[model samples]
Target: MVKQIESKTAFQEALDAAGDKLVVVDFSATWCGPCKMIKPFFHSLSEKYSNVIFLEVDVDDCQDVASESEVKSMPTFQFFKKGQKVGEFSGANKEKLEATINELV
Candidate 1:
């Protein structure tokens, strides 16, 4: 199942739980239109990429996480491996999103 993280503490816990596996963090906010638009697509991607740890962090509720990850845009997707950030993409383009996941996974 895709993990839903609400705070920095939960984010850390997820990283710990993921170990050396790939972690895909969707940084977003409820008020963001684009964020809402991509939510379902992200969910679909989560199902397709079941080997990765998929997570969502609401920027409004998790400002620290957003700032720490340099997420200046809504729906910023950060990719992590071995608990370290390896790559990322902003916005909700299906091609770029799928390519990013395929490249990593």
Candidate 2:
């Protein structure tokens, strides 16, 4: 199952627990139309890529995480391995998002 981390401590724990597996952090806001539009695709990817540790952070609620991760845009997907960021996907295109995730996976 995809993990929902809300606190800084929990975020750290999730990062630590990811080990060498690819972790995908989806930074979004509730009011973002594009963010809502891609919600289903994100969930589908999370299920399809069970080996990955999928997480979501609300930019509005988790401002510290958003700032620390350099999430300057909504619907940004940050990829991490061994607790360090390696790649990411930003913007609203479904095909581009899938291609990026496929490349990482």
Candidate 3:
């Protein structure tokens, strides 16, 4: 299941939960149309990649996280491993997102 990051505490644990797997965090906002549209695609990806981890964080709800994580755009994807950030990018597309996971994992 795609872990929903509703708080800072949950965010930390989700990052660490990845262990040896790649942790993919989706930074989005409820008001963002593109974000809402791609939401299902992101969830579907989690099911497709068993070895990878997926976490969702609403940017509006996690302002502190968005700032600290350097998320400049809506629907930003942050890739992590070993509880450390490794990659970051903006997207509303499924192909690129899946390709990134494929490349990383």
Candidate 4:
């Protein structure tokens, strides 16, 4: 299951504790149509990628994290490993997202 991060501190801790595992963060908003559209697929990915740490940050509820992560779009996907951002992209492209995850994981 994708962890729903509720605060900036929690987000920090989650990243720090992830160690060398791939951390996939989904920065999304409740009002965003595209976000809602892709949410189920994201959840499914979490199930498929058990080795990866999937995280969700509601942009509206966690504005500080959104700002800190430089989330300018509604559904931005950020990839991290070893506490550093390795890659990022904005959109809900299912094929591309899975391909990227496959490559990184």
Candidate 5:
């Protein structure tokens, strides 16, 4: 399940709880076209990769979460492993995103 982030504290606790497992966080905004387009596919990826933790943060509402993650663009994907950032990219490109997931997972 995609945990919707509303606070930076909650986001940090999620990473801590994940331990050695991979955590995928998507930073997106409601007004972004690409963000809307990619939301469904992102959720599908969550189901497909049940071993990985999926998280979604709305930049508009969770400003602190987005800022801490250095999210400068909509649809920014961040992959964390053992509490450290391992991968990151920005866009709606499906192939590249899946490739990153496959590599990290």
Candidate 6:
């Protein structure tokens, strides 16, 4: 399942708990058109990438996490490993998204 982030604290805890495993965070908002477009695809990715940690962060619900991550786009994809951000991008492109995941994995 794509874990839903409830707070900034939980977000940090999740990252720390992930150890060296890849953690993919989807920073998105409910009203964002692109975010809605990719929600299903993102969820399915979690199942396909079974070993990877998937986190869903609603920007409106957890503004603190979004601000800390410096998320400027509506649907920003952030990749983390070892409790540190390794890569990031903003879009709803499935091909690029999967490619990035493949690259990291």
Per-residue lDDT tens digits of candidate 4, residues 1-105?
999999888888999999899999999987889889889999999999888999999988888789988989779999999879998999988887898898886
Candidate 1 lDDT over residue span 10-48, tens digit each: 898888889888899988888988888888988998888
The CA lDDT at 95 in model 3 is 84
**Of the pair 2 and 3, which is ahead by TM-score?**
3
Off by over 4 Å in 1: none
lDDT of 2 by residue, 1-105 (tens): 667779999999998998888888889898999989988888888888888888989988999989998888778999888888889868767888777777886
Q: What is the C-alpha lDDT of each candidate?
A: 0.86, 0.85, 0.88, 0.91, 0.89, 0.91
Name the regions of candidate 6 deviating beyond 4 angstroms: none
TM-score quality measure for candidate 3? 0.95
Clashing pairs in 6: none
Clashing pairs in 1: none
lDDT of 6: 0.91
Q: What tens-digit string does per-residue lDDT give for candidate 3 at 11-74?
A: 8887776688899999999889989999999988888888899999988888998898888998
Q: List ranges where model 4 is wrong by over 4 Å.
A: none
RMSD of 6: 0.8
Candidate 4's C-alpha lDDT?
0.91
TM-score of candidate 1 versus the correct structure, residues matched by position:
0.93
Model 4 lDDT-worst window of ten: 96-105
Error of 1 at 74 (Å): 1.0
lDDT of 5 by residue, 28-87 (tens): 998999989988998998889888999999998988778877888778999999889999
Task: List residue ranges in candidate 3 displaced over 4 A.
Answer: none
Per-candidate clashes, comma-separated: 0, 0, 0, 0, 0, 0
Tell me how far the alpha carbon of residue 44 in candidate 4 is from the true structure, in angstroms, after superposition: 0.7
| lDDT score for residue 63 of model 6 | 86
